[PDB]
Design a protein around this ligand. Sequence first.
Ligand SMILES: O/N=C/c1nc(CCCCNc2c3c(nc4ccc(Cl)cc24)CCCC3)ccc1O
Ligand SMILES: O/N=C/c1nc(CCCCNc2c3c(nc4ccc(Cl)cc24)CCCC3)ccc1O
Ligand SMILES: *[C@@H]1O[C@H](CO)[C@@H](O)[C@H](O)[C@H]1NC(C)=O
Ligand SMILES: *[C@@H]1O[C@H](CO)[C@@H](O)[C@H](O)[C@H]1NC(C)=O
Ligand SMILES: *[C@@H]1O[C@H](CO)[C@@H](O)[C@H](O)[C@H]1NC(C)=O
Ligand SMILES: *[C@@H]1O[C@H](CO)[C@@H](O)[C@H](O)[C@H]1NC(C)=O
Ligand SMILES: *[P@](=O)(OCC)N(C)C
Ligand SMILES: *[P@](=O)(OCC)N(C)C
Ligand SMILES: [Cl-]
Ligand SMILES: [Cl-]
Ligand SMILES: [Cl-]
Ligand SMILES: [Cl-]
Ligand SMILES: [Cl-]
Ligand SMILES: [Cl-]
Ligand SMILES: [Cl-]
Ligand SMILES: [Cl-]
Lengths: 532, 532
Amino acid sequence: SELLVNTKSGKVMGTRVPVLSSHISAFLGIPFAEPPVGNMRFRRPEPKKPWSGVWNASTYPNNCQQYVDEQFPGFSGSEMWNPNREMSEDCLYLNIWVPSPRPKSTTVMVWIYGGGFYSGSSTLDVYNGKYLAYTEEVVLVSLSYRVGAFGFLALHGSQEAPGNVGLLDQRMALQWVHDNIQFFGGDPKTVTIFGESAGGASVGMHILSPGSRDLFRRAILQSGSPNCPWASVSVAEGRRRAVELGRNLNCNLNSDEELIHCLREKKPQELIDVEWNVLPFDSIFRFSFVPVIDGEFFPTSLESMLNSGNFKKTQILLGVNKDEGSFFLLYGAPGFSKDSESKISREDFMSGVKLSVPHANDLGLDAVTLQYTDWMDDNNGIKNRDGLDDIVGDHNVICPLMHFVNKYTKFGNGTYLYFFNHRASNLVWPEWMGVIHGYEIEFVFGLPLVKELNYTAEEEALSRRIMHYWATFAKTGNPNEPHSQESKWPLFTTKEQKFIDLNTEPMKVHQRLRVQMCVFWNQFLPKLLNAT
Amino acid sequence: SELLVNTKSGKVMGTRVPVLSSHISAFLGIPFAEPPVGNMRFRRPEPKKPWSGVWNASTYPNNCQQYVDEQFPGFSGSEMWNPNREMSEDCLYLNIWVPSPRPKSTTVMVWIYGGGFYSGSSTLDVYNGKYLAYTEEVVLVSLSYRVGAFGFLALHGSQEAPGNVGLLDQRMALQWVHDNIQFFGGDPKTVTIFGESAGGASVGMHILSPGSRDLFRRAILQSGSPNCPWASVSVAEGRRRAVELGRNLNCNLNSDEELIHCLREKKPQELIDVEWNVLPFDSIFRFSFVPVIDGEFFPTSLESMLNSGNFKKTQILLGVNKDEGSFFLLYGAPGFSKDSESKISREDFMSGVKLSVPHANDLGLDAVTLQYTDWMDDNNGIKNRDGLDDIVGDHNVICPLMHFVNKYTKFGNGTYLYFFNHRASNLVWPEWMGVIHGYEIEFVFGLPLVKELNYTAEEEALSRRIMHYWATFAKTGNPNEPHSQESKWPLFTTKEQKFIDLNTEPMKVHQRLRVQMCVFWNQFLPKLLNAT
Ligand SMILES: O/N=C/c1nc(CCCCNc2c3c(nc4ccc(Cl)cc24)CCCC3)ccc1O
Ligand SMILES: O/N=C/c1nc(CCCCNc2c3c(nc4ccc(Cl)cc24)CCCC3)ccc1O
Ligand SMILES: *[C@@H]1O[C@H](CO)[C@@H](O)[C@H](O)[C@H]1NC(C)=O
Ligand SMILES: *[C@@H]1O[C@H](CO)[C@@H](O)[C@H](O)[C@H]1NC(C)=O
Ligand SMILES: *[C@@H]1O[C@H](CO)[C@@H](O)[C@H](O)[C@H]1NC(C)=O
Ligand SMILES: *[C@@H]1O[C@H](CO)[C@@H](O)[C@H](O)[C@H]1NC(C)=O
Ligand SMILES: *[P@](=O)(OCC)N(C)C
Ligand SMILES: *[P@](=O)(OCC)N(C)C
Ligand SMILES: [Cl-]
Ligand SMILES: [Cl-]
Ligand SMILES: [Cl-]
Ligand SMILES: [Cl-]
Ligand SMILES: [Cl-]
Ligand SMILES: [Cl-]
Ligand SMILES: [Cl-]
Ligand SMILES: [Cl-]
């Protein structure tokens, strides 16, 4: 029986899942940490104490306690990223899609979801890995981690809640794969972690973190990098937020031991209802509880780690989507609506960029205003929303990642960089949002191969191109088959900075992605504010 | 007789000269002031004392002591701006061109020369007014002023060397025109001052100066403006270049009366030989002794004058050439040469930007650079050479002028704005220099009207078109004839900001001349350095 598999903790039984007129195996809801209930809340993950019997592993597990988006009640474009199982703090489980017949020792891809470190589920329809595992004969693994206060409350010096704890659940999931994937036909020597958004940030931090280097082989980062402004906070302010969350819910603040005991016999929606207020009095693409730079999970600041090359040297394949900031305007900024062109006055474009660069002084606001403004045309309603949506995209992902890539490439054994700019044919979201972040995921997981989903034939063609790039990268460390006649995706070299477009057309090679905007974001603006 | 004219200072007998198969009458080298020699060096002008007997005004006067340019001995492209008569401290003369028959209270146009306040001559061949006098039936005067230390050495607080005496020389000549032009057929109530570069900034400063405002009626500014960064210094810097002048010539510096005494025994070229040594910085496009913000000629700072509206309110007609920067780059910047295409290496580019913005700190240069560079193509000799021509042009001429235009227009009674971008077809300079600043002047004085200078038949029509714009501007305050016939030159209005091309192509209208760069140069960088 290929659906019964005896793991280092106990026996497991999956289920025969159908996929494209064929079937493949699925083991869903397998637990990798002891559930973090009660006193365990906020603590480092403990590995799952072994269990007797057969673990019915044929359903999806629960999701983690997290905010639930209700800006657009019953709107498929937004519900699709919300929890689809029940929520529980007993949520640390991983899923596995094995081909069948079961491979003897094959490549393993581990997916890490995004959701801003405040949300995310391993069980979304759009992360359902049966199509990629079967179509590409890889062993696919979805993991899950604590988010919000539950995984990222930081009180440095305390070991009852040290911070970066949600990152350690992904490491323990990772070590679980390194200990057990071999019995599902996985090769632990060829594990590929790959995430999107906060997932792609987490991949990059395992790249950085010494404790996680040896649990995976390569790395794929989509639309996210470890040095994104929103993906980390320094230890001080990290405490600060933990302690304003106390003031926000009538806690004791003469200690850490009771500031904490104060935050455990809460039930969980109580902390999510108030998760959102402790920020520097503005959101627009900043989230409550996120990884901390703690001198342990991260030995140093990230800038000096990438400077010294203090990280895992390997191959990475990474990229962004074109329009990475439309979601955050839509849900925050003035005069962005799902049901207008969201053309935008100049007056509310200025207030855009004051939101969009949280920290900026008076002179920083004037800089950023000046590089995104067509001063022959300053109340042009479209160029102004297009402009400001580029500020949030450029500043929060695209240019942060291009920093990561230029610094990385100087040390690793290969980089591949993509620019994903295909607006999907069935996208429920408004046109003006362009190629939103998140809607290349549906192509990585072969969803266009399901024809009841009314994708075009050229999008089945493109998801197959992308899946083979992704899986071949996971096997060979290189997106392309050699011995091949298709157009080759050039290595990103520290000199020429080549990259590719991913879309329905035959492929193209561009040099230096978004240089002009990223010279301003990464080299010149940092110096303007450093300046007294 | 006709050439015998009796002035408020005595009789002048001028000469009858040929102009384009016809003849008009010139009065050359009339003295409007007493020789500024001996103990009267650095002293304010004195009115020329009346002369008994006739003044033989048949030949051009002397030229004021200058630095003479000699990078290219023999090169007509440079020689045409060197003094073409004996140099002498006794040099305050003005020349008058009178059409024939002598008219009856007709329009007066006074010309002030440029030369960076260190040079210039009324006697050059491109300032020969006989063509404009003749074809537009106006009276053309060209004045003169002491240049360099002789005109602008300033120890504010002494009355022996107060500074701006060189501007007082121009005013003294304006007063001469106000008191005697009627006796040549001129109308003292319809006097137009105009000038190029430092001559243009000078008409700008008579607009500001309350002691000058009643001596003329309108004003034409060519490629210069009072607020230009090379056009003024403070009482404190002017003093300190005065004392360093003395120090270079081992002068006693215990006081002014000692220092000023010590500097008047020196042969004139003794100052000229050390004039450039007192510039505070290695720089292109700065000159040593320039008009000072002293509190008399200029009541207060030029910005607050332009702000409160404290200036002469009338019509102005003004503009810029396409490529102001080119001249100075050839002379002072590296990689630039007269005989190659002057492709600039990136390393040589950064050298050039530090010389163009010499008062700028480290953050200020990274600002200038990031704004003029294509980072997709940063080693493209052309795009660096051309970009640097644009930095020097916009920093020093183009965007000082628009700042002046915008501020004046709130109170003035009419503004016409031109962008001169025709490169003369007989130009002897390389083409990478484009429209050299100053080579509009051939067209204002009508030199294409003579066929031996081998101009183009369409450049003749441009010069008649221009001369007529300048002349009916002088007469009526609008360069269009009310005979609603040709392309009308729109009013520059604070809202719509229209301006025009002048070239052989039929005339078109544009808006917001170089707006995107001037926002950087007038509103962003100044705020940068006031803060860093
Ligand atoms: O960008 N949208 C931002 C945003 N939305 C809302 C919608 C209703 C509350 C839901 N809670 C929020 C969410 C988020 N940010 C927040 C930042 C601050 C605060 Cl008080 C709440 C936030 C981002 C993801 C969507 C949920 C309110 C304020 C916002 O400022
Ligand atoms: O454009 N720069 C030109 C330039 N020519 C020279 C040649 C003769 C020595 C003094 N002559 C001048 C100096 C300067 N400005 C000048 C501008 C135009 C001209 Cl003809 C002369 C200038 C500034 C620095 C001090 C020296 C030296 C350095 C220069 O840089
Ligand atoms: C496992 O759970 C599923 C879900 O209800 C159920 O249908 C199935 O019978 C269970 N299998 C075993 C062996 O208990
Ligand atoms: C990868 O490493 C090998 C040896 O360790 C080296 O020879 C090869 O050139 C490297 N490739 C890249 C792209 O760095
Ligand atoms: C005026 O001066 C010129 C130049 O020296 C001379 O040739 C001419 O004869 C003079 N004319 C009179 C009338 O003195
Ligand atoms: C100039 O002033 C007159 C009245 O003094 C006014 O009627 C006219 O419209 C003004 N024109 C401009 C261009 O300011
Ligand atoms: P990602 O987690 O997007 C989900 C809202 N990130 C851009 C923070
Ligand atoms: P101008 O007088 O031109 C002569 C070199 N200068 C721009 C100050
Ligand atoms: Cl299916
Ligand atoms: Cl922040
Ligand atoms: Cl398509
Ligand atoms: Cl494959
Ligand atoms: Cl290859
Ligand atoms: Cl131009
Ligand atoms: Cl302005
Ligand atoms: Cl107006």
